[PDB]
Design a protein around this ligand. Structure first.
Ligand SMILES: [Mg+2]
Ligand SMILES: [Mg+2]
Ligand SMILES: [Zn+2]
Ligand SMILES: [Zn+2]
Ligand SMILES: [Zn+2]
Ligand SMILES: [Zn+2]
Lengths: 473, 473
């Protein structure tokens, strides 16, 4: 009940300074992004697109390090506690937004920024009310109360909100039947619901909601013709609006479905959301190049999966085949499941894998998929592989040819988040002497506060205090 | 033949300088060590041992970054090409030691160091002739020809060789029946085969070989009472011998069985070899603190597995249980398989898991192990989980209680190496301004050459050339 021997030299006390001040702050969260994902996308860009990934160029030149992602009582965080660490500077229990397990509210960073006259933008491929954007602006004991969070967004009044989640705004979907779109319009927001409307809009403040739930994966947008915006298209609309504001601005961009694809154990969906993020990176760095008063932070909130390209063949000499084998993919497991519906036949499964993964399943493999979808019978199991039926789908298309991968030699530790430290990267003018090393995720809060002159403190709870509360729940 | 678009900004062209010069050099390789391994050990030290891992303290303070580990024709390397990148500064085809795929020999760095008058030590928990040490000193087209490597070690003449591999020196074990211990003794080497002999010896130069193959895992040494040295004990014998040499010294220390544990999918065995490495780290950094003419490089050669502590329980709130569930473990899967012999009964499998992993196997789980050991029937399969029967043993003790882990909630992407970039850390005097970022693993060669003023070059082979050669095999 006091600190481990050596605490004065641990990662928590590693609090490196920027040594620079800024007027604008962009925070680009790669949700669920692991170093295995990085390696696959890095290789894919070079080998299959003959290009160097923009993220590789940044990690090869600009200050970067590592964050610990553990939450207050668990060595594996989820998104609200991770976002809270960023936005509030303190460890919380998994589950609440800018709040402690006892209900103590915290003040998150973009709320502080708005109070200081910065415009605020939230842009994501998740529901716009999801944990990562929401943890930066509002407090709520239940991350999943997104119908209420949408109301909190209206009252908070950020200049730009872009993402998914029509189910939380549309009077025909909300449980209370309220037309929140109308209420945003009454406060002067331009409301947009398609890519076309988004780009055409000349409204200064924007609410854009482009899907019932999360925005589709890049792989599905790209190859299945879905009329939804890319993350890039959403940033292109937000950035000039925020930049026009006299008092400066803060923006969160979230590549929020990297996490989701990693949950499915779908390496091809992960890759395309990482590649979609890379296009955004190019946009954001070009903006910072033109705007040296602006700091860009690129950070993963935790690892998920993790989905590693693994050694294949004699002396692992065939390991790169798994990268090639991603290029034929044309849809995610999520879209496949949608296509297949609730009572697919083995023959239909087999065709879906052929058409959308480039995979020729054996009878017994397609049958496993049928059982998982129809009878909730999972293979090999459903605890370590806790996301179903997608994880059974991944195992159904496992590599069989040990001499040379016939299907991607990418495996998965789990269908859940992992405890690995993950990427933290700074892109800005004058940071050459910043040495990050391994810091705590709460240090992202300190960096944001230093950059903008918005350092303040939020209350702390000890691990033992939190465990007692959790015992009593 | 042409380089990818953006190659001038890639990680290969990130070649940061030490800006300091040294007399001695210690290279500490964590073989197969991933960021998931790191998170588990970091958590175990704090939560179960009440202390901050020395490696945590180092990453929280001294310059560290990442290395890309891919080899010349594969995005997943093995240990010989990884070592060559370090010791020779060029990419090679997996399998050869300090040699290209067409038989072109390369000059590895410790050979250059000896030519320049440095004493040389190799200390490892693998067989002393294994790829990571051997790649720093000798050339050989086949990393597996360790009987010949042992002969090459005789002419190389390193001041200290310590590790496993009696099968490669013992006249009763070598195919050619030749008594290499006698040959090393003839050259003035003290020969030691046990920890007591090692500590008692006053020989200036040392050959110490402590097991028939690899040295036992730390967990087995520690709890099964085996009479073999720890990595620390081996380093304690080597370091003062090397430090006495007037011309300075180079030393490789290898925590070489982190890799093997991750291959097994045995998280408890991985933990204890990481912790054993951590004790050595404390020893090496104290040596550097007293000898500022000495640089310490700490580096993983690639990730293996990988074995991630994953989200378990409601809101992942029970995920730290897996860390706790490691403390009752008392042996590795390798030691357990030794005990179980070739025709175990389920009841004996069930007893081994109880006594050595603290796991209560169901009847069906115990039977899967028997079938794996006796019939080479593997579950769930044997390709993604390519290390058997150990990977089946891991799956036999998978977590079953989804509300709160009853066995460690640690999962594995595979039984093989992965593509993920890994740790590179510098511990020395005067490096506060070194910003590493993501570099190629071949940069370790440039760092060693800079450190000692021994820069030279080895010939490069192109990926196209290499692929041609491999075709024609
Ligand atoms: Mg998120
Ligand atoms: Mg090794
Ligand atoms: Zn997340
Ligand atoms: Zn998640
Ligand atoms: Zn290795
Ligand atoms: Zn290995």
């Amino acid at each position: 009940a006091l600190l481990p021997r050596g605490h004065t030299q641990g990662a928590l006390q590693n609090q490196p300074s920027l040594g620079r001040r800024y007027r604008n702050l962009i925070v680009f969260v790669y949700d669920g992004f692991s170093w295995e994902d990085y390696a696959i996308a890095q290789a894919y860009a070079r080998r299959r697109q003959g290009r160097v990934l923009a993220l590789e160029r940044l990690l090869a030149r600009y200050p970067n390090g590592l964050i610990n992602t553990y939450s207050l009582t668990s060595y594996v965080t989820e998104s609200s506690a991770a976002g809270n660490a960023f936005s509030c500077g303190v460890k919380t229990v998994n589950g609440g937004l800018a709040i402690h397990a006892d209900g103590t509210p915290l003040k998150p960073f973009f709320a502080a920024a708005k109070e200081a006259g910065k415009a605020v933008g939230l842009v994501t491929t998740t529901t716009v009310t999801h944990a990562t954007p929401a943890s930066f602006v509002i407090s709520n004991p239940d991350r999943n109360a997104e119908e209420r969070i949408a109301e909190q967004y209206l009252e908070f009044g950020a200049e730009v909100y872009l993402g998914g989640g029509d189910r939380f705004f549309n009077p025909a979907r909300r449980k209370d039947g309220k037309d929140l779109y109308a209420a945003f319009a009454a406060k002067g927001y331009g409301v947009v619901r398609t890519p076309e409307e988004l780009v055409r809009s000349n409204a200064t403040r924007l609410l854009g909601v482009f899907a019932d739930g999360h925005v589709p994966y890049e792989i599905d947008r790209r190859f299945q013709g879905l009329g939804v915006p890319s993350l890039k298209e959403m940033v292109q609309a937000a950035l000039p609006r925020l930049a026009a504001h006299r008092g400066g601005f803060v923006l969160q961009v979230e590549a929020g479905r990297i996490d989701h694809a990693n949950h499915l154990n779908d390496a091809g969906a992960t890759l395309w959301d990482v590649l979609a993020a890379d296009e955004v990176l190019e946009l954001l760095t070009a903006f910072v190049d033109r705007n040296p008063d602006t700091l860009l932070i690129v950070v993963s909130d935790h690892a998920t999966g993790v989905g590693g390209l693994y050694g294949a063949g004699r002396s692992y000499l065939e390991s790169s085949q798994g990268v090639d084998l991603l290029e034929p993919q044309r849809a995610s497991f999520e879209h496949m499941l949608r296509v297949l519906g609730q009572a697919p036949e083995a023959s239909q499964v087999k065709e879906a894998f052929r058409a959308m993964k480039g995979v020729d399943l054996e009878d017994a493999e397609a049958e496993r998929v049928v059982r998982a979808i129809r009878e909730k019978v999972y293979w090999p199991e459903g605890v370590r592989q806790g996301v179903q039926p997608a994880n059974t789908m991944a195992w159904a298309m496992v590599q069989r040819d040990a001499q040379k991968p016939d299907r991607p030699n990418i495996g998965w530790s789990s269908g859940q988040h992992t405890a690995s430290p993950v990427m933290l990267l700074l892109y800005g003018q004058g940071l050459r002497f910043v040495n990050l090393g391994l810091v705590d995720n709460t240090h992202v809060f300190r960096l944001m506060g230093e950059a903008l002159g918005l350092r303040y403190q939020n209350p702390v709870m000890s691990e033992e205090e939190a465990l007692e509360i959790l015992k009593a729940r």
